[PDB]
C-alpha cells in the first residue's frame, strides 16, 4: 500500500501546485512599476562597541531601543548601553559554545543556548546584587539555533534535531513539541501577535506553525540550499528568508506562495542575517563577503552597501523605533548605523 | 565634565572591563584540542588513558600545562554547521583503526574520505593534526592471514607489519596540500603506558611554530 500512499501524495501535491499557479495572476513588480526609487542610502558607523575577545555569534535588541545583549564564545554574555557605549552586566556562561541569545520584552530575563543542548535563563532583577541562573531547560537531542521569548513565563526554541519547542519556565517541562521537518532547523521568528511563527531548516523549506495547537499550516519551498535567517514583515503577512544560494526571498501568507527573489550576479556568498525597517521599504542583509547590503524591498534594486567589517557578519538587528541598525561580525566588534 | 551620576556607571564599566581582560589573560593559558574519528575508531580507548549529551569536555594537566579535549562525536546532525565553531583550536586528534580489511565500503576508505574532507576544509587550512593509528596489535595478528591488497589493490610489496603500516601512514599523509600545517603520526598500542607525552611534544612544536610565524620571523 506504500505505492498507493505515494501516488496519493503525488496527486495532492499536483493539486496544490495547480491551485498555486491558478491563483497567481500578476507579480508584485508590475503593480510596483510606478513608485519612485528611494535613492542611494548613506549610512556611517556611529558607535563601535568593542568589548569581546572572540567571534560574536548573536545579538538581540531590547524593547526600549537602548539596551543590547551580546553573546560570544569567550564565554561571555554582556549587555550594553547603545547611547553611551557602556557595559551594565557581564555574565559568565557555563558552556562556552553559544549560538543564540534573547532579551525578554519586559527586560527582566535573558536567555542563552548553544551546542550543549540546554537553554539557560538568567535573571536580572535579583534583590542580592548579581544576576543568577534561574532555570536550565533541557529536553533537546541536538544543538539550539534560535531562542525567542513570548512573555515572562514561556519561551520558544528551535534545535538541530529537526524540531521546535514551546517551554514553560516556571515548571521546566516542554509544553509543546513541533515536528515535521526533515533537517536541521536553524532560524525562527515570531509574528507581532505572538500567535504563530515561521521556521526554516536545512532542507530548503520554511514552515509556519501555530503556537496553541502545533498543527503546521503552510510549507514554502523556493530555495536551493540551507536557510540560515528568517525575519518578518512588520504587519505579519510576509516574511523574508536568507539562504546559501546567494539569494533572499520575500514570501507571502494569504496568497500561499512566493512573491519576490533578491540576488545579484556579483553576489555569490551566503546570507547569514536578514531584517527589515520599521515602515517596510528597505531590506538589510548581511553576507559572508564581509559586508551588508540594502535592497529596495519593492524594486529589488540594490541601494547601498554597509561596509566596514573585517570578517563575516553574523548578527543583524534593527531597533523597535527604526533609529539604528546594529551589525555584529566575527571581528569581535559591533557597529551601530543610522 | 557634564557627567552627573553617570560618573559611577563609568566606574562600574571599567571594573567589568578589567574583569573581562583578566579572565581572557587567564583563559588564554589552556590548550584546546578537538578529537575526531570514524565509527569504532578506538577514540574511546585514548580518552580514558588520560588521567586528571552534547559536547564532552575532558580536562587534564601534564608537566604544568593545561589541556582541554572536546569530544563532539555525540552530535548527530550535519557536520558543516558546527565545525566552524571549532576554528582557532590548537590541534585535531584523528584516530584511525588499523584493522583495514572489513566492511561497515572498506572502513579504511571511509577513514581516508573523512581525513581528506577534514584536512582540505576551508576553516582548517592551517590547523595541524595529530594522527593516532590504534590497534597495532590486532592488525599485526590479522596481516598474516589476509593480504593488504584487498584494501588497496594498487599495493605491491612485503606483507609484513613494518611496511604495511608505513604504506597506510603514507597514503594518509598524502592528503595535505597546504605548505604550513603538518601531520604528526604515532602508532599507539591497545594499552601502552604513556602516550600523553606524544601529545605534549606535538603541542609544544605547534606553539613554537605559531610564535615564530606571529613574530614575522618565519
Amino acid at each position, epitope marked *: 500500500e506504500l505505492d498507493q500512499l505515494r501516488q496519493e501524495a503525488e496527486q495532492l501535491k499536483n493539486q496544490i501546485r495547480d491551485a498555486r499557479k491558478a491563483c497567481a495572476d500578476a507579480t508584485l513588480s508590475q503593480i510596483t512599476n510606478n513608485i519612485d526609487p528611494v535613492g542611494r542610502i548613506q549610512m556611517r558607523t556611529r558607535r563601535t562597541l568593542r568589548g569581546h575577545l572572540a567571534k560574536i555569534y548573536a545579538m538581540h535588541w531590547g524593547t526600549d531601543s537602548r539596551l543590547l545583549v551580546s553573546a560570544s564564545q569567550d564565554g561571555k554574555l554582556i549587555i550594553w548601553d547603545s547611547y553611551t557605549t557602556n557595559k551594565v552586566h557581564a555574565i559568565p556562561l557555563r558552556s562556552s559554545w553559544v549560538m543564540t541569545c534573547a532579551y525578554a520584552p519586559s527586560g527582566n530575563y535573558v536567555a542563552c543556548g548553544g551546542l550543549d543542548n540546554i537553554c539557560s535563563i538568567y535573571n536580572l532583577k535579583t534583590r542580592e546584587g548579581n544576576v543568577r541562573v534561574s532555570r536550565e531547560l533541557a529536553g533537546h537531542t541536538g544543538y539550539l539555533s534560535c531562542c525567542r521569548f513570548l512573555d515572562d513565563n514561556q519561551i520558544v526554541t528551535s534545535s538541530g534535531d529537526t524540531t521546535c519547542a514551546l517551554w514553560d519556565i516556571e515548571t521546566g517541562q516542554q509544553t509543546t513539541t513541533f515536528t515535521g521537518h526533515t533537517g536541521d532547523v536553524m532560524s525562527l521568528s515570531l509574528a507581532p501577535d505572538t500567535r504563530l511563527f515561521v521556521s526554516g531548516a536545512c532542507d530548503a523549506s520554511a514552515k509556519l506553525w501555530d503556537v496553541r495547537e502545533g498543527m503546521c499550516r503552510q510549507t514554502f519551498t523556493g530555495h536551493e540550499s540551507d536557510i540560515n535567517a528568517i525575519c518578518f514583515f512588520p504587519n505579519g503577512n510576509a516574511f523574508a528568508t536568507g539562504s546559501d544560494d546567494a539569494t533572499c526571498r520575500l514570501f507571502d501568507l494569504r496568497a500561499d506562495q512566493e512573491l519576490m527573489t533578491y540576488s545579484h550576479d556579483n553576489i555569490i556568498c551566503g546570507i547569514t542575517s536578514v531584517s527589515f525597517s520599521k515602515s517596510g521599504r528597505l531590506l538589510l542583509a548581511g553576507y559572508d563577503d564581509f559586508n551588508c547590503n540594502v535592497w529596495d524591498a519593492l524594486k529589488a534594486d540594490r541601494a547601498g552597501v554597509l561596509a566596514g567589517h573585517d570578517n563575516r557578519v553574523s548578527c543583524l538587528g534593527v531597533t523597535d523605533d527604526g533609529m539604528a541598525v546594529a551589525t555584529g561580525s566575527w571581528d569581535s566588534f559591533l557597529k551601530i548605523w543610522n | 565634565t557634564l557627567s*552627573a551620576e553617570d560618573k559611577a556607571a563609568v566606574e*562600574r564599566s571599567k571594573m567589568i572591563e578589567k574583569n573581562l581582560k583578566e579572565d581572557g589573560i587567564s583563559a588564554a593559558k589552556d590548550v584546546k584540542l578537538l578529537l575526531l574519528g570514524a565509527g569504532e575508531s578506538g577514540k574511546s580507548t585514548i580518552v580514558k588513558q588520560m588521567k586528571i549529551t552534547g559536547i564532552v569536555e575532558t580536562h587534564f594537566t601534564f608537566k604544568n600545562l593545561h589541556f582541554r579535549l572536546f569530544d563532539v562525536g555525540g552530535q548527530r546532525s550535519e557536520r558543516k554547521k558546527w565545525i566552524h565553531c571549532f576554528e582557532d583550536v590548537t590541534a585535531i586528534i584523528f584516530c584511525v583503526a588499523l584493522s583495514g580489511y572489513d566492511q561497515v565500503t572498506n572502513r579504511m576508505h571511509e577513514s581516508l574520505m573523512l581525513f581528506d574532507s577534514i584536512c582540505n576544509n576551508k576553516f582548517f587550512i592551517d590547523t595541524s593534526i595529530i594522527l593516532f593509528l590504534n590497534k597495532k596489535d590486532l592488525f599485526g595478528e590479522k596481516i598474516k592471514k589476509s593480504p593488504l591488497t584487498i584494501c588497496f589493490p594498487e599495493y605491491t610489496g612485503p606483507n609484513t607489519y613494518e611496511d604495511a603500516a608505513a604504506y597506510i601512514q603514507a597514503q594518509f599523509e598524502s592528503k595535505n596540500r597546504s605548505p604550513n600545517k603538518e601531520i604528526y603520526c604515532h602508532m599507539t598500542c591497545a594499552t601502552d603506558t604513556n602516550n600523553i607525552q606524544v601529545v605534549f611534544d606535538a603541542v609544544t612544536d605547534i606553539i613554537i611554530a605559531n610564535n615564530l610565524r606571529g613574530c614575522g620571523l618565519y
Partner: single-chain antibody
Amino acid sequence: DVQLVESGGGLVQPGGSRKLSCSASGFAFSSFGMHWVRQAPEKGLEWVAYISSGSGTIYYADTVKGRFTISRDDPKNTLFLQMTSLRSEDTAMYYCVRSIYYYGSSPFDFWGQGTTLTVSSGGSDIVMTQATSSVPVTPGESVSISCRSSKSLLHSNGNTYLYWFLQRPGQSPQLLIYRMSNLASGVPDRFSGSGSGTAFTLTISRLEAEDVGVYYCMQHLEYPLTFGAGTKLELK
C-alpha cells in the same frame, strides 16, 4: 534576607575617638556603594560619608572633612567609620545604606538599623526646603506634599534626581520614589510623583493607617547630598 546591623556605640566624654562597624549579610556586598547618614535626636537626616565599589571615590560632608574617616573590608563584608576629636554636635544615631548605580538602578534601597552615640557637655551646597511641617490627615483621603530646590535638577541627559523617603516612628526609612517618577520595589501603587525643574510634588491617594510618619526629599545632582527638614503626618 538582607541584613545590615551596626555596632560600636555608647557614651564617650568629649575629645575621644571611636570606631563604628556595620556588618552585612544577604547580598553581593563587594558590588555596592556604602553611605553613612546620621540623625540628631530632634532634627532630621544629615549626611556623613560615602565609599564606592572598589573604594575608588570617597566623599565627605563639609562639617566632617579631616576629623572622620571611612573604610570597608569586603572579604569579611563589614564597613567601618573612624571618628576622632568629637564634639557635642555629634550626639546622634547613625545609619548604613547601599547605593548600587547603573542604567536603571535604584539607589538607597535598603536602610540599616542604626547605632546611637552620645557625648556629654564639653556656598554652592544646594539648599532644599520642605514647606509644611505638620499636616493632619484622615484615612482614605488624598494628600499632596511638596519640595522646592534652589537649582534646576533636570540635567541634559533627560533625567532629574530627586528621591523620596518615608520614616515610620522608631524604624529606619524606606525608599519610595527614585528620580521623580519611578516607583521602587516592594511599595504599593498608591504613591506617585510629579513636578518640574525645581518644584517637585508627591501624591498619596487613599491614605491608609500604616503610612503615618515623616517624609523626606533628597537630591543627587552633585555631592554633597542635601536632605530636607521633612514633613510629619498625624491622624485626625
